[PDB]
């Protein structure tokens, strides 16, 4: 499936998608991005809209 995580922070900013088997993996894929970049805040999950977000 295809997901869409909106990047929101100081170090990182913008938007992008992620192809994972499930929402759980979809986050693990981007986890390296926000981590390697240092950007970290609060992970939001919603089944109604099926979208991921992060605020720093």
What is d(CA 42, CA 19) in angstroms, rounded to the nearest whole number? Answer: 21
Query: Do 18 and 30 touch, CB atoms closer than 8 A?
Result: yes
What is d(CA 6, CA 50) in angstroms, rounded to the nearest whole number? Answer: 12
For residue 53, the enclosing domain spans 1-56
Q: Report the Cα 30 to chain-centroid distance in Å.
A: 5
- CATH code of the domain in which 45 resides: 3.10.20.10
What is d(CA 27, CA 19) in angstroms, rounded to the nearest whole number? Answer: 10
PDB experimental method = NMR
Domain total in the chain = 1
């Amino acid at each position: 499936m295809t997901f869409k995580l909106i990047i929101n922070g100081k170090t990182l900013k913008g938007e992008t998608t992620t192809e994972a088997v499930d929402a759980a993996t979809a986050e693990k894929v981007f986890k390296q991005y926000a981590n390697d970049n240092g950007l970290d805040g609060e992970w939001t999950y919603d089944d109604a809209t099926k979208t991921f977000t992060i605020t720093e």
